[model samples]
Target: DITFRNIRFRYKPDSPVILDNINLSIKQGEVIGIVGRSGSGKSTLTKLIQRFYIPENGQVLIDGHDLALADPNWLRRQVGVVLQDNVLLNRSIIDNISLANPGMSVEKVIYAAKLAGAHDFISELREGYNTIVGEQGAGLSGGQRQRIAIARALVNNPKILIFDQATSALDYESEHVIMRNMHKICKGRTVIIIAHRLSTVKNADRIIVMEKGKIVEQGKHKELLSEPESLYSYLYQLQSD
Candidate 1:
């Protein structure tokens, strides 16, 4: 399990605080959704969990290893991150996915693609698995790029997966496909999703509401929704309008 204990952080040493006394535990196989308005520090929290920023107070523990003492390579191997703009190879799609785990066999790569819901669409490409994604997945729709990115992340078999506004750039159908594939890929794995779209995380095991770098409320979706005054409920209502 990963735990954040009273974590306090700031980007600039002398700047205003960006995270305050954050405490949360992420267990295996749990899908966590983090939501907040713009500038609420949602992205900062993702960066902190990924160890991009060191906390000034408290600790971030991954299976008991303090992030400060852990090697970056070891930390990276344990986490897979997929953001809105995915990274792709200039080479073929197969090569891109294979990059996740370099030793993966061709058959295993195909299996990952299937799991990502990219198999059918990839099969339709003139080059099929060999289709060149071009620079940064250019020429493909945002959803297609996101699926390929998810496939790459899944193929690595990382224990922790993070989605940072992954589907915010896609159309409705594409978002649905990506979200469904996300569910499949996240099975038996720990997932941390940052989404503004309430529908994307309606079924998350836990929903954390952030405000100005602190967790204002957190709980199961239904439980949070029950309290109309709760941060999650308030945001849900405001966004729905």
Candidate 2:
């Protein structure tokens, strides 16, 4: 479980708090989606979870232990993050996926690719997993590259998986495929997704809507949508239109 208690943070003393006295609780193995306009503190929330920045006030606790007291290296091993612009080196698919652990077994690499929905495309290539990608994954489409990056993040078998606008580059079909497999891919693991696209988060176990660094609404998608005046409903309607 992850808990943020009265959390507050600001980049500089003169800057406004990016995350303001926020309190949240994420249960183990739950899937959470955070949605808001730019600058709503969605990304900053994940950064705190990763310990990228310590809270200026309050505490971030993981599994009941204060994150401030946890070992940085050990904490990192438990978290896997996939960003909208995740980078891929100019190397073979297998090499890229196994970059974190060079000695990772072929079976493990294949499993990760399957979970990320990249196995079919990789297998269709002439050289399969051995095909060399161009600089910064030049040879593959954006969606394909994103899947490979996701596979790489999953290769570590992290307990908490974060997708920060990770599917922004994907088409509807591709995004649906990935989302469909996420439940299985992240079984028994906490999944946190920050997305602008409402569809990307519609099926999450819980949805959080933020405005001005505060949670304006939170609940299941249908529950939020039923409330016409809710910020989540407004955003969802705007996107739908």
Candidate 3:
């Protein structure tokens, strides 16, 4: 579970507010999708959850404990994240995945890859798991690289998983494949998916809609759409274009 209790944040004193008196609660094992226009604080939530940067002065809670009081490293360990671009290094697939924990069993790396839908591609490669990837993952397709990154995040076996636009760059088929596995991949953990694409989050148990650093609207997709003038409903029409 996570809580943001009247939390507020800004990058710097002169910076525009990133989160404005936001208070939210997420239960254990719940899947949450956060969607909003760019700069509306979607990704910032991921940073806060991972303790990337503490808010200037606001309350954050991790499983009922004050986030400020918790050890940063321990807090980070509880969450595994896959973000947009440039996550992979020029390294072997196995190394890339297992480097999340060098001591992780080799079989565990394979386990994660299988769940990520990367097992077949890696297995078919001549060098298999040892195949070297180029800088910025140049050798593999965009989807494949994302799958590898997802595998790396899973190797940590965290209690919380965050996908911060992690699948935005992939092809439709690839995106669907990953989406199909989201439940299986994140089962038993608190999952947060931040995506600009509404369809990506349509199945979320609860959808959070943000605007200008505040949660202007939020609910299940159908509920939000049923309202005549919901922001989510508006965005759905925009995307309908």
Candidate 4:
């Protein structure tokens, strides 16, 4: 389990708090979705999990150990993240995915691609997995590159998966395909998603609504929608209209 205990944080000593007295517990294999307006500290929560930043006060613990005391490399190996700005090197698809372990088997590479919804498109490429993509992923469309990034993240088979606007560049059909398969992709792993589109998170086990660095509301989708005055309900209605 991942637990955040009365956490407080800010970018700098003088900066405003990005997360304030936040307390949360995420169990293994749970799919948790976090949603809020811009600058509402949604992404900050993930950064904490990734150990990109440490809290100024309180602690983030994984299982029963404090994250601050954990080895950075070991901690990162357990978490997989697919971010909005996907980066790719000037290399072949297979090379990019297996960069962490150049000796990774082709079967494993293809399996990861399939899970990311990237296999069919990749197989149709002129050189298939050997096609060299341009630097910074110049050759592939945003959605295609995003899929490759997802595959790269999954290749490690991390226990915690984080998608931070990872499907924002994809069309609805493509996004739906990935979302539908998320259960399979995240089987036996914890999943955290931060998405602007409500549809992307409607099926999550729990939805957390944030405002000014605090969890203003949280519940299953239907429960949140039932509370007409909640921030989540308001946002859902706005998106529906």
> Model 2: per-residue lDDT, tens digit, 1-241?
9999999999787988888899999999999999988889998899998888888899999999899999998898888999668778888888888876867686878888888888988988979998999886746988899888888888878999898898888888878888888878768899999989888888899999999999888999999999999988887787545
Error of 3 at 169 (Å): 1.7
- Lowest-scoring 10 consecutive residues by lDDT in candidate 3? 99-108
With candidate 3 superimposed using the best TM-score fit, by how many Å does residue 93's alpha carbon deviate from the native? Answer: 0.5
lDDT of candidate 4 over 88-146, digit per residue (tens): 88888888887657777868888888888899899888899988898867468888999
The TM-scores, one per candidate, come to 0.91, 0.94, 0.94, 0.96
Quick one: best TM-score, which candidate?
4
lDDT of 3 by residue, 213-236 (tens): 898888998999899799888888
Candidate 4, residue 184: CA error in Å? 0.6
Q: Could you say which candidate leads in lDDT?
A: 4
So what's the TM-score on candidate 2? Answer: 0.94
Give the deviation of candidate 1 from the true structure as CA RMSD: 1.9
List ranges where model 1 is wrong by over 4 Å: 136-138, 181-183
Residue pair clashes in candidate 3 = none
Q: What is the descending lDDT order? A: 4, 2, 3, 1
RMSD of each: 1.9, 1.5, 1.6, 1.2
The 10-residue segment with the lowest total lDDT in model 2 = 232-241
